Amino acid sequence: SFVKDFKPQALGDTNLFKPIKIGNNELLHRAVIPPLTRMRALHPGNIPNRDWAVEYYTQRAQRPGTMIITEGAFISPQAGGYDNAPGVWSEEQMVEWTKIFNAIHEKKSFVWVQLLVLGWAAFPDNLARDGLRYDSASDNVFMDAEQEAKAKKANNPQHSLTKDEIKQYIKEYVQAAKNSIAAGADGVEIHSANGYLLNQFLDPHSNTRTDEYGGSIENRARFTLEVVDALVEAIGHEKVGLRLSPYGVFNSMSGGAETGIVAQYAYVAGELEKRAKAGKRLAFVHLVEPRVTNPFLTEGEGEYEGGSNDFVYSIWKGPVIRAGNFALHPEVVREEVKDKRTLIGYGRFFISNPDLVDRLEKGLPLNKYDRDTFYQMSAHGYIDYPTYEEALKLGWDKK
Ligand SMILES: Cc1cc2nc3c(=O)[nH]c(=O)nc-3n(C[C@H](O)[C@H](O)[C@H](O)COP(=O)(O)O)c2cc1C
Ligand SMILES: C=C(C)c1ccc(C)c(O)c1
Ligand SMILES: [Cl-]
Ligand SMILES: [Cl-]
Numbered sequence: 504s505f506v507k508d509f510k511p512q513a514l515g516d517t518n519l520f521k522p523i524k525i526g527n528n529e530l531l532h533r534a535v536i537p538p539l540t541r542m543r544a545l546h547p548g549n550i551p552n553r554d555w556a557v558e559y560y561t562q563r564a565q566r567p568g569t570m571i572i573t574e575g576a577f578i579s580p581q582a583g584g585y586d587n588a589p590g591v592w593s594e595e596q597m598v599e600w601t602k603i604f605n606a607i608h609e610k611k612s613f614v615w616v617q618l619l620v621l622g623w624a625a626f627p628d629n630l631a632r633d634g635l636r637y638d639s640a641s642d643n644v645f646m647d648a649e650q651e652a653k654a655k656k657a658n659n660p661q662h663s664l665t666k667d668e669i670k671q672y673i674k675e676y677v678q679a680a681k682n683s684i685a686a687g688a689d690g691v692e693i694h695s696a697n698g699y700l701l702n703q704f705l706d707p708h709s710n711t712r713t714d715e716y717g718g719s720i721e722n723r724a725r726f727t728l729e730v731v732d733a734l735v736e737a738i739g740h741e742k743v744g745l746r747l748s749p750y751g752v753f754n755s756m757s758g759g760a761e762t763g764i765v766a767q768y769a770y771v772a773g774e775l776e777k778r779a780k781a782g783k784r785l786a787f788v789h790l791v792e793p794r795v796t797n798p799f800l801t802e803g804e805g806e807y808e809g810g811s812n813d814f815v816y817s818i819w820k821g822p823v824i825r826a827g828n829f830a831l832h833p834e835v836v837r838e839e840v841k842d843k844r845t846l847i848g849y850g851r852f853f854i855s856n857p858d859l860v861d862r863l864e865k866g867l868p869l870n871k872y873d874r875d876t877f878y879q880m881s882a883h884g885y886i887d888y889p890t891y892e893e894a895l896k897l898g899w900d901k902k
């Protein structure tokens with residue numbers, strides 16, 4: 504069905520429908536598919552779904568010139584811990600990714616691989632089964648009681664990374680980025696948001712380290728920036744973006760309750776701008792808005808009103824993608840895109856609307872999403888959401 508009480512607005516008369524170049528890609532509009540974990544990869548081997556993933560991405564690539572960021576993809580076994588999320592370290596994975604990238608490109612759209620390392624958000628028992636560590640910045644602060652207890656029961660207590668282990672992750676990010684480009688991706692996004700490993704280093708709640716990787720703003724940012732630099736060197740700044748969620752609380756990050764949080768993220772933005780001014784400007788910075796501090800919560804819940812991401816624009820002077828409860832708020836998007844370097848990521852409603860871009864241009868009703876199938880091993884709720892035309896044929900204008 505369509506979302507019941509939504510009053511759509513046509514956004515075709517806004518900068519959402521003006522072209523923009525991101526990295527090497529000439530986008531034809533500024534509605535971006537942000538990374539969306541869907542848990543259809545198959546075990547063993549974290550293989551992108553051999554039956555459905557091509558079709559899923561093909562559907563969502565249908566508007567020419569769309570930028571798609573993939574679901575988070577693990578850079579190595581040690582970076583993982585969800586059996587049904589994909590990786591980008593093996594030949595068998597890349598065979599499937601190549602098909603996905605080719606399909607997106609045949610629709611004249613673009614694809615950026617999000618590179619994911621879980622840290623304390625991983626399942627410690629899956630890691631133990633596979634002989635892998637359960638990693639984070641620290642060893643004395645935990646995501647939650649259940650994770651701590653699972654790790655202990657698995658004889659895999661949370662481990663504070665050594666400097667050598669950090670270097671090994673950086674090597675894996677580099678190789679994963681290389682693999683992505685070689686298989687045909689247009690670029691990569693470094694996931695430093697939503698409480699995953701890099702964010703666990705950025706945040707003073709999760710990072711209690713006293714070495715060069717914690718204990719100050721500069722030190723907490725060090726791992727993220729080392730990954731940025733390593734990828735810029737390996738595949739070029741024009742093929743690298745970075746995702747941040749300054750106000751996020753998902754995965755037990757601090758959010759605005761931490762009075763130093765804006766400074767921490769302002770420092771990162773400043774370091775990116777310094778690199779840009781020195782000739783190595785990232786393709787984009789992707790920000791999760793305080794509009795959504797926790798994406799498990801229905802739109803309108805978990806909104807933090809005590810902060811804005813606008814500070815980033817005073818610092819970083821390149822493209823900015825913003826995501827968080829924008830599909831139901833065309834009035835907010837209409838104002839944000841007046842800034843000429845702002846793109847809008849639409850997450851949950853791109854799950855349920857493969858033709859979302861047409862619907863945004865033309866002010867059409869939106870398909871309601873089905874949260875129950877966000878992570879199910881099924882084509883249902885993955886590749887069977889209708890286009891607007893198909894929905895009319897199903898009678899959804901009268902449901
Ligand atoms: C099912 C689901 C999966 C997600 N997976 C990812 C992910 O892999 N990487 C990531 O950075 N964010 C992920 N997110 C966060 C989204 O990219 C997005 O920031 C968030 O849902 C807010 O935007 P929205 O209100 O348009 O959905 C996910 C969100 C949902 C609901
Ligand atoms: C909001 C959710 C459900 C989510 C899932 C996976 C990742 C990598 C993420 O960043 C966020
Ligand atoms: Cl509804
Ligand atoms: Cl799992």
Ligand SMILES: [Mg+2]
Nearest residue numbers: 642660661662
């Ligand atoms: Mg110990």
Ligand SMILES: [Mg+2]
Nearest residue numbers: 873875876884
């Ligand atoms: Mg159901």
Ligand code: NA
Nearest residue numbers: 511512513866
């Ligand atoms: Na309208």
Ligand code: NA
Nearest residue numbers: 554555881882
């Ligand atoms: Na099938």
Ligand code: NA
Nearest residue numbers: 813814816817
């Ligand atoms: Na401003």
Ligand code: NA
Nearest residue numbers: 504883884887
């Ligand atoms: Na249905």
